[PDB]
Write a protein that binds this ligand. Structure first.
Ligand SMILES: *[C@@H]1O[C@H](CO)[C@@H](O)[C@H](O)[C@H]1NC(C)=O
Lengths: 409, 395, 406, 425, 395
């Protein structure tokens, strides 16, 4: 027969899983945590939640579950379901949903010296407040806060697992099996034990283990689907200055159509940005900038059309403006002759009116050239600055600014 | 620990968890209730639901769970599963669609004097009367009502732990500001009988919305469209683009209606502030389009069919142009040949007369455009200020 | 009562609900499987899932639950909680989620003869493949496969349920008029039931309930087809607009915008399967291509209208086709000072004559444009009418068969 | 605490079996009186036709086994027992959507010394009620909550409406109970009627679970403000803008642009409206009828603008202005519509040629002007014929919508108000 | 059955289900694991999650559960609740967001020799690397890794039932075609110790997308818009609608970009094929608009302020039109009266000269349009073929 049966029936007989295994008064149970990251499933900006698949390793000593191997044919390791044993109530505190516990309650590995090794896998959804300032050229700093929801610092002592005498102060990632998220890349992954000094060694919240994930976005999707089309469409507003300023030129058509396309892009971006209202995202800043510039260019096109279509009758072209712009910048015979003279006079007058119209058109063209140069410079500088601020938004070199250590294996 | 194992075995040997912890059935258990707000997960204006992550701190004394520490190796406190002992059934009276009572049966702390401390976590989804009159500059006041479901005040009495909820460890929302918070205890009696009070504790949190997301995402585009609305009046009618421009502004606003519909709450209790503003913008654009159509019709009036009324000439050609200071607008075969030349000359007479009349019509249209540009810029500014500044000054 | 307590204690002293009730080793338990449809909630086509609210009318015999009513004050039947008796693990096998079992465990009815009856309620999400070819003018054939998850044909024998006064089997889904809500988007045409075996596996047997349902396409008719018809009318009308108006491109390209907007509207409603193209999408693509060709021909007509001798020379074939032949078919059918002054007048006359000839050639080009535009008007009208009528009759001839074949 | 002894006597010493009905003889019927209290109406999202509500189910029955003499113990006049220890009547919402038949929170029961047991568990219920879209958004819905006892047949337990007393006479509570103080009105819906009924089905049999029923009805009216503000008024104004196309001169090449843009805006409004309603096909919604009518009318306006432009641009070189057309569109309709030495020989020949050319050009121009006048007449006629149709159709449609109040008395054949103010007798 | 009742009573009296079913603790339990794929529920490209409906067949011997048929009326097989006996803890190692282990504890088939057959159902939501490079013509290789969580290979050994997953009762997907499927067993050792193998079984399925839905609903409208943007160059400048057509095509493409973002996955690992084609179409339309503006500017070139450069005339008026074979393009008061007539004649001369220069500019613009029409039709065809032909040929 299986000796494990006799051994386990002996161990669990007269065993109370409600009772912390503190050997005596003032004995503190050491619980060591080691987090392994299997998959970074996603980071939902709308919900401000990070979903991860982790294997959390919890180790402690339970003196009641020790045995002498010589009495059980050298058995030194048994598996007992975790629901039969006392467990330290290590839970994820900063969970968005009400899921504090692990997902699968694996068996606990129990060694003959009382050492207990529990490796339950878990799917966790933790709160990650989103820094939207540089979205989509942003990096986030998410944390997983672990603490015991039952016992305080007088009863348990949360520590980071130590391997071969060196503290494992980082999230463990197996190089081969780990798969890149596809939207996020992990730059730093430190772990440290934290204290809430506002509390005393009671309250169960005094101590905690925090695992940090400093992740950088890969903005290829946004660049290809929103940024580049938006920039190309918005740059079209500088073309209005080369269209003729009369009916059929279609200055207003082009400018207002570009503005309408930018409105469509505003609707498109409204569905991606997080709803928090502490900062304006970089992409939103750029859309506002281009919309304002397009409004200005529509105004300038309207002004140019008004200037170019002026007539001697509605407006008078004062010589000051001309200098300013075109500078620094038988009775039958009697009746027949009367008719001929009147014809010549009318033709002369019409030609003169035409000439004045052409003067106004030239003034309009000069204004077009000047405003084109101004608008090209403005648009180029604004776009370059806005999308160069994001390119220089780099993750800090160190996981903790003032800490020299790199926190890597 | 063998001492603690023996203690726990002895405490629950003859313990009935359905009986109240009172020495005599006429007494009442006194429970100190405290609420610890940890996070404001979300507010749903359409469904009037406020979701919060809280801890419900409950303290009371169970006389049946005493022991002498000297008999148990000096043990003074233990942790017990909450399912092992009598618990008070505190229920969120104004629950919307969450859980009515505590579902996370966490462990509780028990002193050797019977004093019990229990702080289970919970997610409260409460019914929140939302007021959208001043959206997005709106302040919301809504509560969490708590009480013992099945016991009256003569069996189980609940008293608040402090004067207000504990927000010591409250995560900052990023969308709301906790202006104030407090908790009040109420005694409710019924016509039955005045000897059976019914107690509850209401915690209310006054929240102020942070109006930046909605500002930049809704109000600013509305301002651009409003500003462009009156721009059409400076555009001359000769360029066949007055209707193009105004109608494109209207289409842009109609497309933006999608953004508003998907962003602002869909309640029907009252009209939001931005709802009034956007309706104003719509009517503004439509009026501009109507008057632009009128002006275009006026500009193209032909002398042959329409003759200028005297009052139109008197007003728009003589009076108003004088009082427009900003504008720079001004204020054998020989007999056949001879007969043909005369005919040409008289035809030019007629052409010049018709051209002059059409020019007068065009001038009147231009004057109307200038007046309308002034009026519409003024109306835009006045309407925006009237809609917004009234609420903005109060802040 | 006290006697009910005594009877229950006697019945369940050594009763084991884990053991299937068989008088003798080798006996089979006959289980009658019936279904009552209370409400056909949804037929989500995005996930190919039908949600229904049903009752399972199960009946079998348990020899262990037998008693003499004379000895128990004439107690003829008991209502025993369903978990206290053996029950067959009748489940929905073709469920889309992982929910095989019932939701509400109503207690069983046990009669003194050993006849057990159980009518649990459930909200089932079954998976039925959607034939997306005539959508939204389509009928679907969604099934619900019921069998014992554990026991096979060597242990239980599935049968059809009996009617209220059990005399003959009921081979259909039962619908209780007192409690039944019409879907409002689906009409139930047939609802048969049948037992199915498998030739390869002799231990398999199930009872399948088939729902043949026809969609009511009013919503889609209005919200997609009517606007498409109006847009097609505009696309035809573009060819009646004179080229001088400068509005052909506005009309045609705005029609194209409208069609793509309707495609955006329809995106979130058509099932995303790749076995076929739904008829509505085919109609949208036909209208889209028709509008695109209207745009192309409008561009061609505008190009023809704005030609002049200064740029183009009119070839013989264009003249013959568009001026001689087509019009009748389309019903169009159209002293130093004195010498200086004399020279000036002569020059003016020559200029007028040259302008007259130039204008005549331009008018020939514009007439060619007019004739081509009329021809395109007629051709597009005919094509649009024929195509729309063909597609709509094809859609309207799609009806579920008279015989369900099940 | 005497309660411990009393409860031990009731449940353990007497051998209480919670799986057995509380009847002394197995032929009597247990009467369960139940009532419903509506804590708040959460939602009636019409897309999937689900009514979410927070309700408190009130239960009451007698249990002769849970009786005691209050004097034999201390004067204990009431007990609180968990429902897992006593017999409980399983009354389930039959017409639920999500698969939740039971109450949310199994609270304690209350027991008096005479065996009277009251149970008041709260619940969140998601019932299915079909949506009548006929007058959307001026519609009122009639949603129902149907409760059945599926654990016992009618011969074993009888469901009844709870009763109350005012002045010594008890009456049934035939309505949903609403606490005027605690209840907060829904953002979108107003409750008009709230009857309660016990339904028997005589075509079934008492020895079945489909024979009895207790139904609570909620006749609620939508508050049409969100839709009036955001959907109807802008659409109505943009549609009225289509009539201005006729007042816009043909010289301004923007008639077609205006009409087509109006049609595009109406298509956007159709897209917006399509998402707000279920896919049912019982009827076309009122807003849908209006959108279809107005879109058809605007398409007609576009066609008529196209015809007018085709008329305006005809010339003598391509069209003939017949006498019939001239009389109709220049005399009759404008009146009805109240509308407003060889060198000298060569010189002489050249001037004669110039004169002839000018005369021909003048005739061409005047006939072009005649075509322009014909186009203007067609515009005026079209406006006079279409603007009144648009205005009258809109007014008629929306006053029909605004005249759709609920019947003011549920159960058409019933003269009873089912109002909490006037209980029967 | 009284025989089976007695058998079950005697078969679990002293059965501890926490203990492994081995006669001696140095032996191992040999479990035959087989996977049966019933249905491919969905493939989530954004989160890289594949949802499958499977049956996880498991077979092993439990010597403690054997009996002699002759003592129980010849019973040879019974059904037991799976929660009554020891079960192997098979876990889906690459679970994304589903259950890690079996949760539906269905009954198992127990043979009189101790042989056990357990086939519980499951929904596996497994993480798998999605490669969107040839989307929608993409082939995916997604796996299911299974293994015993808490036992090594010396205590519990799993071996595949067969070398392939069972797809006998597979449901045809309608979106994916199952190219291939196989299962492999791996031995994994650690630097600890080479005597303790850790076993896992990996099942992988090669899936080919059926690219009809995406073709029709995305690619065809893009082709149509590309064709129209190419067409813009045949529209004469005199009809003032070139900008209307080109910018309306751009607006249609923007609305369709909205549609695409609604439909196509939002991955970011690499640019899909549709992404490259959409970007190419956008750049195509933008270049078309720019060159259209250039042509319009050239057409309305004032001869008064500009004079045609000699090279422009040489190229566009002399040589280029000759090589365009398919085209049809061309290859007292009497003194005052006399002076007035002379003035009319000389003004006509000047107007004729100006008109000739303007007509030359228009001719140059028209020639440029012909050249660009050919060029842009060629580019449209070439790019459309280039983006897709490689993948289409690979298939
Ligand atoms: C364990 O048991 C063996 C007998 O099998 C004994 O010799 C040995 O001393 C025991 N170990 C200890 C630490 O006492």
């Amino acid at each position: 027969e299986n000796e494990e049966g006799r051994l386990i029936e002996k161990l669990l007989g007269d065993y109370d899983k409600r009772i912390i295994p503190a050997k005596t008064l003032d004995h503190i149970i050491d619980v060591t945590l080691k987090l392994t990251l299997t998959n970074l499933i996603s980071l939902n900006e709308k919900e401000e939640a990070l979903t991860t698949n982790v294997w959390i390793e919890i180790q402690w000593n339970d003196y009641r579950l020790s045995w002498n191997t010589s009495e059980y044919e050298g058995i030194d390791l048994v598996r007992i379901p975790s629901e039969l044993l006392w467990l330290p109530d290590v839970v994820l505190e900063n969970n968005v949903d009400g899921q504090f516990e692990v997902a699968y309650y694996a068996n606990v590995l129990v060694y003959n010296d009382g050492s207990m090794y529990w490796l339950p896998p878990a799917i966790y959804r933790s709160t990650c407040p989103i820094a939207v300032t540089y979205f989509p050229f942003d990096w986030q700093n998410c944390s997983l806060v672990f603490r015991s929801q039952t016992y305080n610092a007088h009863e348990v002592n949360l520590q980071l697992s130590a391997e071969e005498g060196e503290a494992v102060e980082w999230i463990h990632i197996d190089p081969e099996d780990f798969t890149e998220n596809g939207e996020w890349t992990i730059r730093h992954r430190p772990a440290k034990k934290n204290y809430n000094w506002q509390l005393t060694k009671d309250d169960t919240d005094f101590q905690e283990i925090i695992f940090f994930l400093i992740i950088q976005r890969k903005p290829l999707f946004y660049i290809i689907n929103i940024i580049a089309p938006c920039v190309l469409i918005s740059s079209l507003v500088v073309l209005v200055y080369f269209l003729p300023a009369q009916a059929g030129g279609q200055k207003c058509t082009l400018s207002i159509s570009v503005l309408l396309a930018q409105t469509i892009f505003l609707f498109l971006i409204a569905q991606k940005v997080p709803e928090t209202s502490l900062n304006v995202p970089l992409i939103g800043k750029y859309l506002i900038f281009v919309m304002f510039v397009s409004m200005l260019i529509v105004m300038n096109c309207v002004i140019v059309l008004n200037v170019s279509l002026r007539t001697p009758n509605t407006h008078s072209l004062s010589e000051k403006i001309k200098h300013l712009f075109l500078g620094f910048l038988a009775p039958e015979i009697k009746s027949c002759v009367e008719a001929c003279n009147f014809i010549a006079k009318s033709t002369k007058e019409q030609n003169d009116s035409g000439s004045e119209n052409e003067n106004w058109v030239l003034i309009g063209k000069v204004i077009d050239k000047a405003c084109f140069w101004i608008a090209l410079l403005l648009f180029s500088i604004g776009t370059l600055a806005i999308f160069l601020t994001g390119h220089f938004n780099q993750v800090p070199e160190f996981p903790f600014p003032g800490d020299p250590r790199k926190y890597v294996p | 620990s063998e001492h603690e194992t023996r203690l726990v075995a002895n405490l629950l040997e003859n313990y009935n968890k359905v009986i109240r912890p009172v020495e005599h059935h006429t007494h009442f258990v006194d429970i100190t209730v405290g609420l610890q707000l940890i996070q404001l997960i979300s507010v749903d204006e359409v469904n009037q639901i406020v979701e919060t992550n809280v801890r419900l701190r409950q303290q009371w004394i169970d006389v049946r769970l005493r022991w002498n520490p000297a008999d148990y190796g000096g043990i003074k406190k233990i942790r017990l599963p909450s399912d092992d002992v009598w618990l008070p059934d505190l229920v969120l009276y104004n629950n919307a669609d969450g859980d009515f009572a505590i579902v996370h049966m966490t462990k509780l702390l028990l002193d050797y004097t019977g004093k019990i401390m229990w702080t289970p976590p919970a997610i409260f989804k409460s019914y929140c009367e939302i007021i959208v009159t001043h959206f997005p500059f709106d302040q919301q006041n809504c509560t969490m009502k708590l009480g013992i479901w099945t016991y009256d005040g003569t069996k189980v009495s609940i008293s608040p732990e402090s004067d207000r909820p504990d927000l010591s460890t409250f995560m900052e929302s990023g969308e709301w500001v906790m202006k104030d918070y407090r908790g009040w205890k109420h005694w409710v009696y019924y016509t039955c009988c005045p000897d059976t009070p019914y107690l509850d504790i209401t915690y209310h949190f006054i929240m102020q919305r942070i109006p930046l997301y909605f500002v930049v995402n809704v109000i600013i585009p509305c301002l651009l469209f409003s500003f462009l609305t009156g721009l059409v009046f400076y555009l001359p009618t000769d360029s066949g683009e007055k209707m193009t421009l105004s109608i494109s502004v209207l289409l842009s606003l109609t497309v933006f209606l999608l953004v508003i519909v998907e962003l602002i709450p869909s309640t029907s209790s009252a009209v939001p502030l931005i709802g009034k503003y956007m309706l104003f913008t719509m009517i503004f654009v439509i009026s501009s389009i109507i008057i632009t159509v009128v002006v275009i019709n006026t500009h193209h009036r032909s002398p042959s069919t329409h003759t200028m009324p005297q009052w139109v000439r008197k007003i728009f050609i003589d009076t108003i142009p004088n009082v427009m200071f900003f504008s720079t607008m001004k204020r054998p075969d020989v007999k056949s040949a001879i007969e043909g030349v005369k005919y040409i000359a008289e035809h030019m007479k007629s052409d010049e007369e018709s051209s002059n009349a059409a020019e007068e019509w065009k001038y009147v249209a231009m004057v109307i455009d200038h007046i309308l540009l002034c009026v519409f810029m003024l109306i835009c500014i006045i309407g925006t200020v009237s809609v917004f500044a009234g609420r903005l000054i109060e802040l | 009562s006290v006697m009910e307590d005594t009877l229950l204690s006697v019945l369940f002293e050594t009763y084991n609900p884990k053991v299937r009730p068989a008088q003798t080793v080798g006996d089979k338990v006959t289980v009658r499987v019936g279904l009552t449809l209370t409400n056909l909630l949804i037929l989500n086509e995005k996930i190919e899932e039908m949600t229904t609210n049903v009752f399972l009318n199960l009946a079998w015999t348990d020899y262990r639950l037998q008693w003499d009513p004379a000895a128990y004050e004439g107690i003829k039947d008991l209502r025993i909680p369903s978990s206290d008796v053996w029950q067959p693990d009748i489940v929905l096998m073709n469920n889309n989620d992982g929910s095989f079992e019932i939701t509400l465990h109503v207690n069983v009815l046990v009669q003194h003869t050993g006849a057990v009856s159980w009518q649990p309620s459930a909200i089932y999400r079954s998976s039925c493949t959607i034939k997306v070819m005539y959508f939204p003018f389509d009928w679907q054939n969604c099934t619900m496969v019921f069998k014992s998850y554990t026991y096979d044909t060597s242990e239980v024998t599935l049968q059809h349920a009996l009617d209220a006064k059990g005399e003959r089997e009921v081979k259909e889904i039962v619908i209780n008029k007192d409690a039944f809500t019409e879907n409002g988007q689906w009409s139930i045409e047939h609802k048969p039931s049948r037992k199915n075996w498998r030739s390869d596996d002799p231990s398999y047997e199930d009872v399948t309930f088939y729902l043949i349902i026809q969609r009511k396409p009013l919503f889609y008719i209005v919200y997609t087809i009517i606007p498409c018809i109006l847009i097609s009318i505009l696309a035809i009308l573009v060819f009646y607009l004179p080229p001088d108006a400068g509005e052909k491109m506005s009309l045609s390209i705005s029609a194209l915008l409208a069609v793509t907007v309707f495609l955006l509207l329809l995106a979130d409603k058509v099932p995303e399967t790749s076995l076929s193209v739904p008829i509505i999408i085919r109609y949208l693509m036909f209208i889209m291509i028709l509008v695109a060709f209207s745009v192309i021909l409008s561009v061609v007509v505008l190009n023809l209208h704005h030609r002049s001798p200064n740029t183009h020379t009119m070839p013989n074939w264009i003249r013959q086709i568009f001026i001689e032949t087509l019009p009748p078919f389309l019903w169009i059918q159209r002293p130093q000072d004195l010498k200086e002054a004399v020279e000036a007048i002569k020059y003016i006359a020559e200029q007028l004559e040259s302008a007259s000839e130039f204008d005549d050639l331009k008018k020939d080009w514009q007439y060619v444009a007019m004739v081509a535009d009329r021809l395109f008007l007629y051709v597009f009208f005919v094509i649009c009418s024929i195509g729309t009528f063909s597609i709509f009759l094809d859609a309207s001839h799609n009806v579920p068969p008279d015989n369900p074949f099940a | 605490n005497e309660e411990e002894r009393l409860i031990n006597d009731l449940l353990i010493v007497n051998k209480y079996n919670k799986h057995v009905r509380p009847v002394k003889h197995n032929n009597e019927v247990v009467n369960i009186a139940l009532s419903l209290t509506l804590s708040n109406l959460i939602s009636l999202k019409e897309t999937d036709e689900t009514l979410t509500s927070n309700v408190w189910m009130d239960h009451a029955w007698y249990d002769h086994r849970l009786t005691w003499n209050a004097s034999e113990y201390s004067d204990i006049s009431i007990l609180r027992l968990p429902p897992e220890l006593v017999w409980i009547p399983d009354i389930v919402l039959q017409n639920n959507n999500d698969g939740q038949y039971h109450v949310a929170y199994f609270c304690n029961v209350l027991v008096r010394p005479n065996g009277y047991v009251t149970w008041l568990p709260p619940a969140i219920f998601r019932s299915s009620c079909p949506i009548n879209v006929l007058y959307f958004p001026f519609d009122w819905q009639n949603c129902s909550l149907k409760f059945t006892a599926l654990n016992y047949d009618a011969n074993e337990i009888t469901m009844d409406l709870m009763t109350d007393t005012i002045d010594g006479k008890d009456y049934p509570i035939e309505w949903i109970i609403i606490d005027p103080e605690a209840f907060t009105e829904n953002g979108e819906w107003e409750i008009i009627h709230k009857p309660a009924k016990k339904n028997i089905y005589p075509d079934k049999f008492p020895n079945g679970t489909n024979y009895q029923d207790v139904t609570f009805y909620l006749i609620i009216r939508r508050k049409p403000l969100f839709y009036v503000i955001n959907f109807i008024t802008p659409c109505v104004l943009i549609s009225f803008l289509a009539s201005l196309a006729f007042y816009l001169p043909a010289e301004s090449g923007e008639k077609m642009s205006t009409a087509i843009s109006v049609l595009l805006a109406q298509a956007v409004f159709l897209l917006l409206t399509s998402q707000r309603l279920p896919e049912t096909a019982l009827a076309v919604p009122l807003i849908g009828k209006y959108l279809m009518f107005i879109m058809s009318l605007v398409t007609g306006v576009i066609v008529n603008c196209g015809i007018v432009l085709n008329f305006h641009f005809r010339t003598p070189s391509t069209h003939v202005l017949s006498t019939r057309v001239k009389q109709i569109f220049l005399e009759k309709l404008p009146r009805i519509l109240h509308m407003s030495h060889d060198e000298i020989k060569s010189g002489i020949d050249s001037t004669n040629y110039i004169v002839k050319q000018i005369k021909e050009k003048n005739a061409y121009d005047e006939e072009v002007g005649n075509w322009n006048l014909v186009g203007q007449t067609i515009d005026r006629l079209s406006m006079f014929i279409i603007t009144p149709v648009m205005v009258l159709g809109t007014i008629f449609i929306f006053v029909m919508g605004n005249f759709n109040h609920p019947p003011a008395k549920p159960f058409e054949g019933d003269p009873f108000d089912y109002s909490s103010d006037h209980p029967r007798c």
